[PDB]
Amino acid sequence: DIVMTQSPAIMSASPGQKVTITCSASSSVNYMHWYQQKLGSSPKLWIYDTSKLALGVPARFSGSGSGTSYSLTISSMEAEDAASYFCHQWSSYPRTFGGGTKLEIKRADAAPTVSIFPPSSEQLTSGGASVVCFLNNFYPKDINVKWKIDGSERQNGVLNSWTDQDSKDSTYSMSSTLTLTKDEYERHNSYTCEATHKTSTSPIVKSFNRNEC
Amino acid sequence: EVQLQQPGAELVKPGASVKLSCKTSGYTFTNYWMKWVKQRPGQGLEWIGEINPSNGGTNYNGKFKSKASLTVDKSSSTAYMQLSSLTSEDSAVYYCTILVYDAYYVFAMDYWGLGTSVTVSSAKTTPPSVYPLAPGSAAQTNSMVTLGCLVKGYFPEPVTVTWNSGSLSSGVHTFPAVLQSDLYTLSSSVTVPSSTWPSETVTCNVAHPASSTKVDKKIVPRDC
Amino acid sequence: LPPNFGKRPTDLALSVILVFMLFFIMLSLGCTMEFSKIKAHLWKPKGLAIALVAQYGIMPLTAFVLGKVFRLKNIEALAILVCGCSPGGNLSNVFSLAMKGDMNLSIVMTTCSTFCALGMMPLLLYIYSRGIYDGDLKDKVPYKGIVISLVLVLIPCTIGIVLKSKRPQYMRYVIKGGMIIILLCSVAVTVLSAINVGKSIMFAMTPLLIATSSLMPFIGFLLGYVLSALFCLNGRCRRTVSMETGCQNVQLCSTILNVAFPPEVIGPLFFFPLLYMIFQLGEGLLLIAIFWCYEKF
């Protein structure tokens, strides 16, 4: 079976930058085709036979290459191009797809808006406590978080959830959950969420103390 | 108007079997092959097999020959895939596809299905526990206030968290859920004007189709 | 988006014109053989056995080895192999007529080859496609198409023979009329094939496949001639056997490929039968011209 490798795996581009994505096979591929998938939707055929365009595909997309190297080029990328692109061959069975290339939208960097919410009283009555750290509207995607108890680092029970690029401002978000027992939450009073991001060298620290309620 | 209709999600138990269906309408059913594609979250698209509705000829994947089995009922114009011995590595989205392709009049077009999020469960359906989150009073009061309601301990996916019955559409960050101890936890955030929060009630409601549980909870400041 | 199809108008016209061609060519050729000579050639299987052995032991093997040593893809190798195992055609009969051959051997050879194809195509297909095709290929074989091809070959020739034997006078008139209508159907087929090859230029194919499709008919001609010569056959029987071995049927390959695979997997191979027929016709015409030049000198 032919194994295709797609590069780059993840990318970022501006609305107007010329962009090229490459797919290299492990054997001679007679024609290569390209599929586009917008997040929360099924894949759609974009370019077939290495040069043709399916119905509805804008004329900004082109394909080239041969042998074991093919390329998809967008001349003037627009805001409606941030998606996932896959290369696909159906000439040498079995049909195989590429790994996938995520084309995103570039913007100016932004700083996270770190927030802290106290554990709910109902959760404490139940017997647990989930400390929540909410980081919103930061660019780029890369960011690190740290949970500190009374000034002491603790990475146990940290659950991190990302988001995807927003259609409005093309930013990201983050949720950090620290799940502990009620007794564990009673043992300490100061909880600090620290965010390290490219925008600011000094981490953004949000503190909450249950001693003062 | 070619359209292929599929179910939304089918939870099964490990070692059991499932029969996914794809119902077609708007085109001559016995004129194009039907292909089945698998998309695992984290991996890429995989091609399972093809079936010809008018002949029954079937090409399969090398690694999906003993697992999948495509059938056709031309009376209702429906295609079926039977998955058997479903392990944990069989949780993915399954699409049914048809490709219109003419080299005489050179042209191509795709028609996909919305997908069927098959998830092996091995666990009982659980209703959510929507613990509300209220910003602390010590925090500075600002024109824009963030409100959330952590949703914990429920199964299986999907789920919908919406504020004021969908009245709010901007600033609603619905974070993807995360699996721990066979239960997936999700949290949401909404940014609202400072005046609106104590003047107009902002209630987040969570709908679980599988348990059919609809829970509405408002956000109020912590009063002690 | 609405139409989704509409390639019928030219394909059906070409099919009906080719059917009329075959009917009238068989009509015009059935006045050149005698029933007694046909049974004389049938009762002695020397030519029939050699032709069948060549066509079903060397042509599939030649196609398989050419595909293996030419580094061809799965679909291309399958196409060349199905073309290799196909029965003989009626271009063989036409060429034998134009090469001064035993037309009593031609019809019997073609009919026996077609019946042996009905019998043996699943067997050869399975044996030689166990490697390049995961699924089964025995079902895709067009038995009904082969049967109707046999009927369309036999009926006009039989009625022409009985017309010539019983009413010699009507033979010349019907032959002249058939030639007249064939003259126009020829330009029709020529223009349709010109359009088809013009489009095939835009949707080009693998040139290794072109090399293999050029090599196959020449190898078939040479091996048939050598096998007939080594078996101590007649001067014209040798040419008849070689020309029957060289020419193969390509409609069966197209039908099998269309049934077995989706249209997008075939793709450029939609015009493979046309290319194979073009190569067969060119090489046969070259050999006929060479033989006629040698005979005149």
Nearest CA to C149 among C190, C199, C90?
A: C90
Sequence-distant (6+) residues with CB within 8 A of B47 are A94, A95, A96, A97, B35, B36, B37, B38, B61
User: Is C74 part of the contact surface with chain A (CB cutoff 8 Å)?
Assistant: yes
Nearest one of B102, B98, A51, A88 to C266, comparing CA atoms: B102
- DSSP per position, A183-212: HHHHH--EEEEEEE-SS-SSPEEEEEESTT
How many Cβ pairs within 8 Å bridge chains A and C?
Answer: 20
Q: Do A23 and A86 sit in the same domain of this protein?
A: yes
Q: Report the residue from C7, C264, C270 with minimal CB separation from B99.
A: C264
Q: For chain B, what are the domain ranges?
A: 3-120, 129-218
For residue C7, give the nearest of B33, B104, B108 by CB distance.
B104
Q: Which CATH number fits the domain that encloses residue A45?
A: 2.60.40.10
Per-domain residue ranges for chain C?
7-296
What tokens does C76 get? 């291309």
For residues C247 and A71, the answer to whether their CB atoms sit within 8 Å is no
Report the distance separating Cα B106 and Cα C220, nearest Å. 35
End-of-domain residue from the set A71, A88, A105: A105
On whether any CB of chain B is under 8 Å from the CB of C198, the answer is no
* Among candidates A97, A119, A126 on the partner chain, residue whose Cβ is nearest the Cβ of B44: A97
Taking contacts as CB-CB distances below 8 angstroms, the residues of chain A near B189 are 134, 136, 173, 175
Distance of alpha carbon A119 from alpha carbon B187, whole angstroms:
13
Please check whether residues A49 and A99 belong to one and the same domain. yes
Task: Check CB contact of B55 with chain C, cutoff 8 Å.
Answer: yes
Q: Residue A93 and residue C134: Cβ atoms within 8 Å?
A: yes
Q: Is C197 on the interface with B (CB under 8 A)?
A: no
Residues sharing a CB contact under 8 Å with residue C297, sequence separation 6 or more, in sequence order? none
- Chains near A with 3+ CB pairs less than 8 A apart are B, C
Could you tell me if A28 and A96 lie in one domain? Answer: yes
* Yes or no, beta carbons of A30 and C206 under 8 Å apart: yes
> End of a domain among A42, A72, A105?
A105
Q: What is the third-level CATH fold of B129-218?
A: Immunoglobulin-like (2.60.40)
**Rounded-to-integer distance, Cα B222 and Cα B185, Å:** 23
- The answer to whether residues A81 and A127 belong to one domain is no
B104/C contact by beta carbon, under 8 A: yes
Architecture of domain C7-296: Up-down Bundle (1.20)
CA distance linking residue C94 with residue B28, whole number of Å:
42
Looking at beta carbons, which residues of chain C come within 8 Å of B111? none
A97 and A166, same domain (yes or no): no
Question: DSSP character for C44?
Answer: S
Are residues A116 and A132 in contact, defined by beta-carbon separation less than 8 angstroms? yes
Domain range for A147 is 113-209
The whole-angstrom distance between residue C30's C-alpha and the CA centroid of its chain comes to 18
Nearest CA in chain A to B109: A54
Q: Give the number of residues written for chain A.
A: 213
Structural tokens at position C23: 């009917």
> Distance from CA of residue B53 to its chain's centroid?
28
Q: How was this structure determined?
A: cryo-EM
Give Cα C60 to chain centroid, integer Å.
14
Q: Given an 8 Å threshold on Cβ–Cβ distance, is A55 in contact with B177?
A: no
| Domain final residue pick, A54, A81, A105 | A105
Contact residues, B window 115-134, toward A, CB-based 8 Å cutoff? 115, 129, 131-134
Q: Are B116 and B60 in contact (CB under 8 A)?
A: no
State the greatest distance between any 2 C-alpha atoms of chain C, in Å, as a whole number: 64
Enter the CATH code of domain B3-120.
Answer: 2.60.40.10
**Helix (H/G/I), strand (E/B), else coil: A96:** strand
Nearest residue in C to A29, CA atom: C73
